[PDB]
Structure formats: C-alpha cells, structure tokens
C-alpha cells in the first residue's frame, strides 16, 4: 500500500513548491495519476485477500472504497477551486494540504490490518475534515453541534478504544487476519452487551443512525463543497467498513443485539425520506437523503447475510458517487444565486439544459433506476431483508416510494416550472462544472456494466 | 377581496362578475348554442328583474342568495378556456419564455450571427439606462409619504421621458416563442 | 366606468413601446449570419453491417458457449420425416368418424 | 395553423361582432363608440360584449380588465397587448 501512501505524501511538496497559478493544475494532474494507479488494487482472489505487509492489506471491501477515495481528491480540487479564487495563496495551499492529508489518512484507514491502527487513522480523519469545515465553511453557527460532538466522543469512539484495548488483552492481537481464525463466540452476558455497544456505537454515529443523525444536516450545511463531498462520499462509509470488520468478533450476540437498531433504521429511513419532502434547504435535503440511504447499509450489516453485505458495499460505493454529485449540483447553483434556498431559483432547465440533464441523471441514480449500482445495492439489501423478515418489504417499498418522491421533487422544484424573475446572474455552465458532473456520473454509469468489482469480499 | 388597484369589490362589480360566472357555468351546463342562448336571455331577464333595486342592504342580501343559487347550480367541471388558468394549454409555453438578459450571456461568435439584432439591442439598453434615473426621480416626488397607496404607476409626463418601471413590461417574452 | 386618463395615457405609451420592441424583434435578410461550413445507404449502414456484427457475435461467441441460445425443439406430428435420422413417424390411429 | 392577428383583422372582427348585436345600430357604430355613453348600453350589455369577445377570439379577458373596456378601440388594444401583434 506504500505505492499509494508515498505519492499521496509527495502531493505535499507538489502543492507547496508549485507556482501560484499552477497549484490547482499540478495537484489535479498528479491526483488523477494516483487515481489511475489505484486500479492495481483489483488483484483480488476468490479465497485470499490481497495482503501486502504486516501493516496493510486489501480485500474486496476495502479496495472499492480506496479507489473511490483516490478518485475523490481530483474532483474535490475541481469543485473547491472556484470559491477559493480570492483566497490567499498560502491559505489555498493549506486547504489543498488538508485535503491531501485527509486522503492520506483514509487510504491507510481502509487498509489497516490491525484494528487500533484503524482506530488511530479513523479518528485521525476527523481533524483535517474539522479544519476544512470550520475554516472554509463561509459561516459558522454551531451552538447545538458542540454538545453533539461531545456526545459523539462520549458515546462513540472512546468506548471503542477501551473495547479494542480489551480485545488486545484478551485475544492477544487485533490483527483482523488473526481474528479471522481466533474468534471466539461472544455469548449472552451483560459484559458482552456493553462490549457490543462499545464496538458498535462509534460506527453507528458515523453512518449515521436515525436519532443520531442530528450532526449530518448541520455539518453538511456549514461546510465547503469539498468537505460535503468527502463527508457524503467516504466519511460515512468508514462506519460501514468498521462495522463489517468488527461484526466478526460480535457473533453470536449480534443476532439479538441488532433488533433495536434495525428498528431505528427501518423506521428511520421512512422518516428521513419523508423529512426530505419538507426541506427548504437543498443541501439539507441531500443530507437527509444520505441518512435515508445509510439506514439500509446499517440494516444490511446488522442482518449479516452475504446478499446484505454485497448490497451494502455496492450501495456504499453508489451512494458515495451519487450524493457527491448531488452536493456538487447544489453548489453549482449556490455559486450563482448565493443562497441554498431550494424555492429561490426555479425553472433552470429553461436556462441550463445540459446542467438539467445532469440533474436528471443524478436524480435517477438517487431514486435507484436500474441497472445502476444504486439499484443493485438497494435491491440486494431488500432481498436479504426479505429473507430476514417478510414484512420488512413494506418498510422497504414505502421507502422506495418516498425516495422517488423527493428525488424528482428536487428535480421539479429546481429545474422545472417558471424561472425566477429577479435572478439575472444565472450564467451558462462552466466547462469545469460540467466536467465535475461527468466525472461523477460516467464512472457511476460504467460500473453498471461490470458491478462485480464493487460487491465486496463475498461476491 | 384581492385586487391590484382597489382593495375591495364594489357591489356593481360583484353583480357583473356573478352574472358573468353564472353565464359561463350555464354555458357549461347548456352545451348547445341555441339552447344556451334561450336560457341566456331567460337568465338576463332574471338578472334585470332586480336591476333597479335602490336598497343596497336588500341588494346585498339578494346578491348573497344569488351566490347561493349559483353555487347550488354550478357545473362541476366548467368550460375553462385552454390558455385560461385551469385550462389544458395554460402556461404551456412558459418553458419557452426565456428572459431577455440571457442574450447578454451569449458568446460573441453567436452574437455575431445576428449583427443587426444586437446592434439594436445595445441602443435599447442605452435607452433603458438613460431613462432609469429620470423615472426614479419622477417616482420619488409623486409618491406620497408612507409609500404609494395603490399599486398603479403614473405615466410619462414630460415629452422625451419614458413611463416608470417599464422595461420588464415592454421587453417581456412573447406568448408563443 | 373605464380607465382614467392617466391609465389610458400609460397604456398608450406602453403600447407604443411594446409595438416598437416587437417590431424590432424582427430579422434581417442576411440574418442568421452563418459561419462558412448513395440512395440506399440506410439499409447498408443501419441494417446490413449490424446483421454482419450480430451474426458474427451469435455464431462465434454465443452459440460456442453452452446453453446460451436454447431453442424449443420443433413440434413433431404423426407423419413427419426426421432429417437427423431418416425415420418416418407413423400416423395416428384410424378415426372413429363422427360426421 | 395559428394565423397571425393584425389590428386590421382584430378591428374588423370586433366591429363584425358588434354589428351583429341587436342593441347597437350598424350606422352609428364607430371605432371610438363608448358603450354606456355613446351607444347607450348597460354594464350587463358590456359584460355580454366582453364575453362575446371571449367567444370570438378563443381566450378569456379577466374581470379586472373586463370592467374597464369601454370602446371597441380598447378591445382592439387589449387583444393587441395579449397577442403581440405587428411584429
């Protein structure tokens, strides 16, 4: 994995020694070269994972999240370069350095052989994201979110730390490869119940869980575009990756500890999708859509069937691409009308036809139009949860109505109807913006041809 | 009720509007033209029976139970004209009604495709910008204290000036682009 | 009552401006100034070359793989002659005629 | 389809409707004949004339404008406004 970490670190002398008009071009070029390099991780096997060293490994779960992570950096550099034009050059290089450092943390978070190195890199990803959100977020009003981050630290990552140190003392190792063969059944006891909550609640907030999703339509709103792209595309999926690693140790107690949280997600995707029908803020609507889609990944991990893991990792990759494109479309209107109000600028297909085509395609991938991998992930999760319980199809299908309903409403409000009269700064689409939409959508459409590379280790 | 110029409906306006809506809903009830024309003169006689009513309270009550008569006898789906609100062709071409300022955002290679049009549009915009401050200083000395009472605007008073708040009414899109 | 003289004057002035705008939306005889830029080729490009491509695909890549094109076996009647064998199927029983 | 309207056409059609009306004589009717004061009609008759215009041209005049059209020239000017004639 050291053929990826070292070029990502060499992006730091590349971004600090570059000429002042060249720092976007150079970082975009070399991060696209790293993303082309990232396809060497597709050397996967039907029995063995790709095990590089004592520190790094890659099965077919971590590999597509790595490719999506290394692909997300050039797109963030394209998306965030317009609204940093009047920024200081040194502050602009600090922004690019925090993006590069976040990629550096993520690409060795997903490959972490041992679980406390996963914990260190997992909680290391929060700091450059925090600095990007609070130094370039264009407004900061976080009176209620401070107490929620305190709740995240109390109920989340610290019990995970104590639990992983406990497994280190009990099993003697936290290597996931060793824990594949030295796993003991975790029986019914109160010690094992608090053990399960400690191993799971950090990743429950990171997904997020319904009821615990209070941070996500704030942190998505108060962020720049690169921060919202990396939150929607990668930083939610650390929770799902960590659940799919840590549920190896949590058998068979998961088979009766999943029942509350499954309810919290199965009803929760009914609520948040419905919440998207009453959103004034477009970026908040995409945030609650992200909650409504990660609820299915929570259910699919907690029911731990093969079809559910295949659908959950396909849904993670697909929703990463789709929701990142949705935030980029929301920014491509916000950079013109200077307000996130979804009822402000209407009828935009009269003014921007190709951009409305991109809105249509991102909406159709948002509502899981087949054969897109949004639908493949959605569908396999629905099949596995039907095998879990035959009634849940109702709570699936009703969600699959409301998921359609706000997806086209977001299309109908922003793009259709009568244009707003008093807005006359609606410029034509820059080639940068259309390139950003295409570099989201065309990989998402090409993955419908060959979905087997995004269906996880047990395809 | 809700009008741009008047804050209410006069009783004369209420009578005329109820007569018109009664005839329209009647024509919806009474499809054939000679049959509707017969019942239309009958209904005109019914409206002209109490045309000469001096008492405005009695005329108010008669108008009220006439509204009850019209509501009891209304058609469920009355004939709406196609480009009337509620019609089948209503606001159909609003997706083709591009605002004029978008011509400002064209590329010069396609602005040069229509040279006379934009060469005239330059002096249209010139006319607008040398009319604007004159019509603002026209409106600031005629508007009473507290703002204007009614939404109606005064016309161009001097010769050479243009009427105030005129550009979006003149340069509005055509109804069939 | 109709309009006021102020409203009639404003409608006349706006109407003159509106008709000038609509008349000045017309086109010049040179406009648009454009920049300076086989009877049955349809059945060749759209049919015959795709029939070639799809016949090559089905003949050398699809039917060369097992069970890809599975066909219902043809309907055999009494009296038929089998081409793979040379065997004549015998007829039915003689009819207990009804009419 | 959809033939262009002209002020000659709109004028001749509005006067053609009003000359088929049994309370307006066809010899006193001009292009500036006021309905209440010059032709001596009722507001009920004026509403019937605006509804006849709606029957003639295939669209609707709203009541806030139907209460003020008090000559055939105002009718021709209003249809000129709502149809964009003489492009």
């Amino acid at each position: 994995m050291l053929k990826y970490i070292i070029p990502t670190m060499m992006l730091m002398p590349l971004t600090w020694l570059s000429k002042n008009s060249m720092i976007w071009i150079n970082t975009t070029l070399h991060s696209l070269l790293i993303s082309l390099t990232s396809l060497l991780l597709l050397n996967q096997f039907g029995d063995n994972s790709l095990n590089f060293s004592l520190t790094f490994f890659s099965d077919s779960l971590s590999t597509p999240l790595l490719i999506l992570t290394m692909w997300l950096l050039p797109l963030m550099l394209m998306a965030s370069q317009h609204h940093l034009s009047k920024e200081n050059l040194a502050r602009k290089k600090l922004f690019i350095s925090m993006l590069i450092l976040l990629q550096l943390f993520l690409i060795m978070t997903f490959t972490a052989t041992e679980l406390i190195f996963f914990y260190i890199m997992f909680e290391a990803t929060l700091v450059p994201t925090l600095i990007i959100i609070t130094r370039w977020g264009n407004q900061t009003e976080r009176l209620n979110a401070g107490l929620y981050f305190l709740f995240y630290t109390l109920a989340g990552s610290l019990p995970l730390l104590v639990a992983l140190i406990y497994i280190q003392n009990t099993m003697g190792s936290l290597n996931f490869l060793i824990l594949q063969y030295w796993v003991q059944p975790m029986p019914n006891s109160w010690s094992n119940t608090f053990m399960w909550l400690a191993c799971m609640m950090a990743f429950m907030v990171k997904m997020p869980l319904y009821g615990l999703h209070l941070w996500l339509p704030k942190a998505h709103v108060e962020a720049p575009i690169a921060g919202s792209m990396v939150l929607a595309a990668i930083l939610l999926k650390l929770g799902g990756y960590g659940m799919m690693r840590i549920t190896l140790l949590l058998n068979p107690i998961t088979d009766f500890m999943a029942y509350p949280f499954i309810m919290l997600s199965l009803w929760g995707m009914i609520m948040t999708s419905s919440i998207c029908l009453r959103q004034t803020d477009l970026k908040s609507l995409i945030a609650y859509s992200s909650v409504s889609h990660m609820a299915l990944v929570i259910v699919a991990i907690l029911i731990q069937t093969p079809w559910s893991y295949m659908g959950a990792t396909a849904l993670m990759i697909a929703h990463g691409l789709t929701s990142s494109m949705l935030f980029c479309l929301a920014n491509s209107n916000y950079e013109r009308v200077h307000s996130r109000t979804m009822i402000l600028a209407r009828g935009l297909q009269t003014l921007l036809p190709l951009m409305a085509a991109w809105w249509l395609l991102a909406s159709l991938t948002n509502l899981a139009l087949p054969p897109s991998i949004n639908l493949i992930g959605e569908l396999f999760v629905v099949m596995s949860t039907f095998s879990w319980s035959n009634i849940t199809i109702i709570l699936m299908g009703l969600n699959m109505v409301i998921t359609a309903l706000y997806s086209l409403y977001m299309l109908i409000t922003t793009q259709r109807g009568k244009h707003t009269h008093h807005i006359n700064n609606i410029l034509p689409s820059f080639t940068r913006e259309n390139a950003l939409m295409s570099l989201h959508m065309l990989p998402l459409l090409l993955l419908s041809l060959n979905p087997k590379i995004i269906l996880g280790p047990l395809y | 009720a809700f009008l741009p110029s008047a804050a209410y409906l006069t009783h004369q306006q209420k009578v005329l509007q109820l007569y018109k809506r009664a005839l329209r809903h009647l024509e919806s009830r009474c499809v054939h033209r000679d049959k509707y024309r017969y019942f239309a003169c009958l209904l005109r006689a019914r409206f002209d029976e109490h045309k000469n009513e001096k008492d405005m309270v009695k005329a108010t009550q008669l108008l009220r139970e006439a509204e009850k008569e019209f509501w009891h006898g209304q058609h469920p789906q009355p004939y709406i004209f196609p480009e009337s609100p509620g019609g089948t062709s209503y606001e159909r071409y609003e997706c083709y009604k591009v605002p004029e300022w978008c011509l400002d955002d064209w590329h010069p290679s396609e602005k040069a495709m229509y040279p006379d049009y934009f060469a005239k549009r330059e002096q249209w915009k010139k006319l607008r910008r040398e009319s604007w401050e004159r019509e603002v200083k026209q409106l600031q000395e005629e508007t009473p204290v507290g703002g204007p009472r009614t939404e109606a605007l005064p016309p161009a008073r001097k010769q050479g000036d243009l009427p105030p708040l005129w550009w979006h009414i003149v340069t509005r899109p055509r109804e069939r682009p | 009552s109709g309009y006021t003289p102020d409203e009639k004057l404003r409608l006349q002035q706006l109407r003159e401006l509106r008709r000038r705008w609509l008349k000045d939306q017309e086109l010049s005889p040179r406009e648009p100034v454009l920049p300076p830029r086989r009877h049955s080729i349809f059945a060749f490009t759209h049919v015959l070359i795709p029939v070639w491509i799809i016949h090559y695909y089905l003949k050398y890549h699809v039917t060369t793989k097992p069970y890809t094109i599975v066909e219902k076996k043809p309907r055999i009647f009494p009296g038929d002659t089998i081409l793979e064998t040379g065997e004549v199927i015998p007829p039915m029983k003689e009819f207990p005629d009804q009419h | 389809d959809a033939p262009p309207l002209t002020l000659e056409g709109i004028k001749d059609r509005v006067l053609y409707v009003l000359k088929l009306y049994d309370k307006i004589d066809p010899e006193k009717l001009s292009v500036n004949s006021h309905f209440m004061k010059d032709l001596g009609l009722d507001s009920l008759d004026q509403v019937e004339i605006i509804m006849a215009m709606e029957d003639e041209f295939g669209f609707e005049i709203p009541d806030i404008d139907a209460e003020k059209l008090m000559c055939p020239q105002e009718i021709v000017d209003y249809i000129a406004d709502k149809k964009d004639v003489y492009e």
């Binding site: 921007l352 689409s429 | 591009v98 978008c102 955002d105 396609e110 682009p177 | 086109l27 | 492009e87």
Partner: peptide
C-alpha cells in the same frame, strides 16, 4: 418573411 427572433440561453458552452 416576418421571421421572429427566439430568445434562448447560450448553447455555446
């Protein structure tokens, strides 16, 4: 004759 100009946004970009 009487060709009319159709206002539309810039299809160049």
């Amino acid at each position: 004759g009487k060709r009319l100009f159709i206002i539309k946004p810039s299809g160049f970009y």
